């Protein structure tokens, strides 16, 4: 698969604001925010560009604005995913940016979600900022 984030720590950031840390192993994010938390995630690289597939994140563990998760959709097995593209400033600040979502099922051909450009409200970005 894809080692992008793999082994690789950062803070998250929101409207400006720190509201936890994020730590990818091989499978899973360990997210440390109000309480700790782990989501099955990976990585695809179509092109030129990267999308993360994240589980949900509750906000019991991490306590972002919900509008965060309006994004595409992609289900492999009996997981859901949250499909986020991947933006690298300058290999310190990175951005999670939503992807416009569908009225159909969700993808199960992780490349076909580089058929779908951005959502047009991106103020609910997520912000990571390498450790
Ligand atoms: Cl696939």
């Given at each position: ?22 730590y ?25 560009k ?23 959709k ?58």
């Amino acid at each position: 698969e894809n080692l992008y984030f793999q082994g690789q720590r950062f803070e998250i950031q929101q409207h400006n604001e720190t509201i936890g840390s994020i730590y990818f192993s091989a499978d899973y994010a360990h997210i440390r925010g109000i309480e700790k938390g782990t989501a099955k995630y990976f990585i695809d690289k179509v092109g030129s560009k990267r999308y993360l597939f994240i589980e949900y994140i509750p906000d019991n563990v991490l306590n972002c604005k919900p509008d965060f998760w309006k994004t595409l959709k992609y289900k492999k097995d009996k997981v859901t995913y949250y499909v986020y593209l991947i933006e690298n400033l300058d290999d310190e600040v990175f951005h999670l940016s939503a992807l416009q979502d569908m009225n159909r099922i969700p993808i199960d051909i992780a490349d076909d979600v580089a058929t779908m450009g951005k959502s047009p409200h991106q103020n609910d970005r997520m912000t990571l900022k390498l450790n």
